[PDB]
Each structure stands twice: as C-alpha cells, then as structure tokens.
Amino acid sequence: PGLFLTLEGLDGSGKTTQARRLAAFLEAQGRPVLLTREPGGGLPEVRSLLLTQELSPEAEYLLFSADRAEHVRKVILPGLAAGKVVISDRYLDSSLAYQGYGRGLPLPWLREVAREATRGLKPRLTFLLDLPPEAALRRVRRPDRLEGLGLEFFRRVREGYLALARAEPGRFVVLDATLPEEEIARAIQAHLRPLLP
C-alpha cells in the first residue's frame, strides 16, 4: 500500500528541506520512497513555459494543471500502486493558494479543473510549513516566475494556505516554520509514525 504525502508553504518556509529530510529518513528505515515536486514533476518543460512574459493567470493555472495531470498519472499513482511513500514538494494546494487566493482566480473553477486533472487524488497528509510572508521573503529570493509581485501577494497566499488548512483539518498538519529545523523534522516524523508503521 502506498502513501501520498505533500509539503506546502511559501518559498523559504523549509518545505523543500523537510521533504528531502523525510525522504532520507524513510530510506534509512528501508522504505521505498519517491521524492518529487511541482511544478515540473509531470512535464519538466512547464518550468520553462512558466517564464512567458505577461502570461495570463488562467494560462499559468492551466499549464500547472497539465503538468499536475501527467504528474499524477505517470509519477504519483504508479508509485503508490508500487507501495512507495510518494512525497511531493507542492501539489494542488499550491495552485489554490498562489493562483486562487494569490492571483484571484475563482476557486470553484480551479477545483472543477483539478477534479479530472488529479483524478480526485488527495494526499493522506499535508505538511504546511507556516510563517509570516515578511519572514519568508527575507530567507530567500522569490522564483524568477514571481517577480514584481509584492508583499501583499504573499500575504494573500499565506492566508489562503491557512484557509485551506481550516477547511481540511484532518489532512493539513500546520507547523510553525520559525521553530528550529530539528523540531519541525521531529514533528513531521511524529505525525507519520502511526502511518509508517
């Protein structure tokens, strides 16, 4: 039986680091793992196409969705059927936070599109590394994709993630990303222990 886990948060939150550490932990326990990420896990060329000038938010979401559709069908679902713990650094939630709450695309449309794109595949758990957007922005420069975009954009993203976590409190594990790195890794692993076992 596979297990689908995701990690989410602003760039700089630590989700990338924690995704890697979790993979390495499970590998040390003899468990097969697939460590992946969006965007690019399905169609790597979408990472390039996402640097098109003045790209509409709609087309941006649809390109992310095409990538995610391949990601689910070619990478994630086969890994799960193979019994792996498939860990994605970003999944659907990132599109809802960034393109929904961030860019203002209507959420019902985002979800109508995602319904087939994902085949309804949802993570068993999702680790949200939460922290203030001012704090995120100081840790690391933004993706080339997200320049111009100001503090208020990132606030809407941060709050959107938190609204997603409120609606799906069983799925979302919200962690304070200003805790020490070891403490976040400890908490992630504590959440996973009864599942892996």
Added chain:
Amino acid sequence: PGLFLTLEGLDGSGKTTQARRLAAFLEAQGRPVLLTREPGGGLPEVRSLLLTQELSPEAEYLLFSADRAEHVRKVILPGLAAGKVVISDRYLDSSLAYQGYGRGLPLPWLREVAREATRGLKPRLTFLLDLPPEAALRRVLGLEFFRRVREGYLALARAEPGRFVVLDATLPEEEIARAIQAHLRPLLP
C-alpha cells in the same frame, strides 16, 4: 466591427486550404484580416512540446487550453478590437471533437475548463469541412477514432446550428470557397 471566424474538421478536410483562401480573398478586398491557428497561436512552445511520450489526454487538453487562453487574450481579442476579421484554423470545437468525442474525456468538464480559458468568446461562424476519415486520410490511432471525431463534429453542429456551417468537403475547392464567401458576404463590414 471585428469578426471572429473559425474553420474546423479532420486534418486533410481542406480546412487549412480554405482558411488560407478566405484570408487571401479578404486581403484582395482590402479588408483587414488576421489568420491564426490552434494549437500554437497563443503559446508556440505548446506545439513543439506536444509530441511527448504517451501524454495523457487530460494533460493534452489542459495544454491546448493554456495555449488557447493566451491565444484569445493576446491575439484574437486585440484583433477583433482592431476591427479585423480574425480567422482561426481550429478553435475550441477541435478539442471538443478530438479530446471529448474522440478520446472520451467528459464533455461537461471540457466546457468548465473552456469557460475561463476562452472568456466565453465564441466564433460568429464556424465552417466545418465534413468528410469521412478515409477521404481525409487519403489526403494526409485507428479509423474508429477518426469516425468518432467526425461524428462529434456533426453533433456539435446539430447542437449549435446557427454557428456551424456544415460543408461537404469532397466538393471541389472552388465551390467550397464560393460557399464560404457567400456565407460571409452579409456579415461584412
């Protein structure tokens, strides 16, 4: 005002030929015209890429849709705002025909996706060059697939009869071109 026209049908139906005939005819009259096409009219790199190993139909449609979203916003709407006749060789109907009726993706989903992608922009007329696959294949995935696509096109046309001008694409090119011009005549300017 501007005028949005599309051409549709199987590859090898004469759709591209007629698209070009129509543009040339409008240029000969001194009528501003923009000839474009899908896929590639919005994001050319979607065309190049498209050739990806065993690409899911869902992902394919989503990529077409990203292309189509940029096409409508950056190319077609400005053209129409300039008072041009904008002619697209393929538009939404192609994705509905091929991905929907052909590959079996659910039609209501396809249209949910399209509603924002196209901002609701529909062609004033859509010339469907209808013919059997065998005739199309003669000129340029099984036969059964192409039949499903052809029949889907006819189902679209029956649902939207005012918009679809169904033409028998086995007729001589000139007779088709003359027909297309006759359908257009009262719309200009």
